[PDB]
Design a protein around this nucleic acid. Structure first.
Ligand code: CA
Ligand code: CA
Ligand code: NA
Ligand code: NA
Ligand code: NA
Lengths: 247, 241
DNA sequence: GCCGGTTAACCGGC
DNA sequence: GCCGGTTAACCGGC
């Protein structure tokens, strides 16, 4: 991680920060800090895409523009769709998109850190948030394996806890954790919640002992196993209880 | 519907409205049907304010006088017990955006806003599972003449520094053919449609609707389970040993 | 403690 | 046309 060496600082600077009154905008402050302290490495996802295509003005159409990624897995995680990519121009730049994978990209020497900020109202009853689609993650692992891209990118999370203090939201603490250091078989896949893996960053175990390739194979075994169990569970929860009204 | 008879009134007032870059719907209804119209949390406040002698969640839950509406409208037990004139519910995940109620009959209204300049993407309408439980509850308690669940689509496009409403649509969930309802399991098990596309040709009774919906729901759940193997298990087996 | 369902719409494959 | 996956976190049952 490129963030990890300055996380202590980040943690200190963010605590006490405020945003007018839900905590979503704290992500903008995370970005501001990173832009100030790692200016050359830091991008919004759409910003990285805009920069990539701006540097290659002669490369037009979605196919050629896709070739600029030089990585199947990164293309998968970061690109916009074919029409969006084809219609891109300096006058028609990418702006934020609701379901972009990452909030913030940090890249250096062609290694990629995908950072997702998780904001959390710390006064409400704890509810683990959507982290990332378990299915997007499965596809990522399969593509990592097919292409032997095991040392190219990390997926990392920064939790920003906040509380309502008068007119303002204030940050009270933060946490940092790396997806690829968690034990894959311990990740919670909430199928109803858009097939999303869910955890609090603060709680994520970080003791995985294997290679990235091993992480990928292991998560895939986990994913496949959970999907099988869910297929069965749906009869239990969505079929059985209601059959008495229709038979 | 209490809204349907005045839809033309609403469509006209809205069809040129602009917000800065559309709960103008609530405003209009509140001004033209003030005795009937509530935000959900507002209806609950009103209900509990009008019954000051009733405290705690069990007793306040009895104020609904209907298990099904209890299930659709109420907040959780602790929230309800902790409610007071000085601790009022605020807007919230709530089933409905707007409630219109008259003579012990309830219209649940959900407003769907839509950026009409982008590729059409049918929005989450309501949980197929919440709907399933609701039908189940309607049947168990024979509450077939109590409420409707209705939708109002408001289409808009960006124009300058503002969003402009260019059209609207209105449709009643309980007039749609249940078996035509698209359940998108990945998207939080939500029914999905555009209001303007919703068929309104169901001819049977409310009870028939509920039974037909349940058969549909159960059938679609079974299909989803099966399709999970094909999409989430099969394509990944080759990587595991 | 443990568990998982719900709201807001929203992009883009073939 | 037809089809369905993803982001934002968030609430309250035993
Ligand atoms: Ca985020
Ligand atoms: Ca709505
Ligand atoms: Na994001
Ligand atoms: Na995410
Ligand atoms: Na809804």
């Amino acid at each position: 991680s490129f963030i990890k060496p300055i996380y202590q600082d980040i943690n200190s600077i963010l605590i006490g920060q405020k945003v007018k009154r839900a905590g979503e905008p704290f992500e903008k402050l995370v970005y501001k800090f990173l832009k100030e302290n790692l200016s050359d490495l830091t991008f919004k996802q759409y910003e990285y895409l805009n920069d990539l295509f701006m540097k290659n003005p002669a490369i037009i159409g979605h196919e050629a523009r896709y070739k600029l990624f030089n990585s199947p897995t990164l293309l998968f995680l970061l690109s916009r769709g074919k029409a969006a990519t084809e219609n891109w121009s300096i006058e028609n730049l990418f702006e934020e998109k609701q379901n972009d994978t990452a909030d913030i990209l940090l890249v250096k020497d062609q290694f990629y850190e995908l950072l997702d900020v998780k904001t959390r109202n710390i006064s409400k009853s704890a509810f683990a948030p959507n982290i990332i689609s378990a299915y997007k993650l499965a596809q990522t692992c399969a593509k990592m394996i097919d292409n032997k891209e095991f040392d190219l990118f990390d997926i990392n999370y920064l939790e920003v806890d906040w509380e309502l203090n008068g007119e303002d939201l204030v940050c009270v603490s933060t946490s940092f954790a790396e997806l690829f250091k968690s034990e894959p078989s311990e990740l919670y896949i909430n199928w109803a919640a858009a097939m999303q893996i869910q955890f609090h960053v603060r709680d994520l175990d970080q003791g995985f002992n294997g290679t990235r390739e091993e992480w990928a194979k292991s998560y895939l075994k986990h994913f496949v196993t959970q999907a099988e169990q869910r297929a069965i569970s749906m009869i239990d929860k969505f079929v059985k209880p209601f059959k008495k009204y229709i038979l």
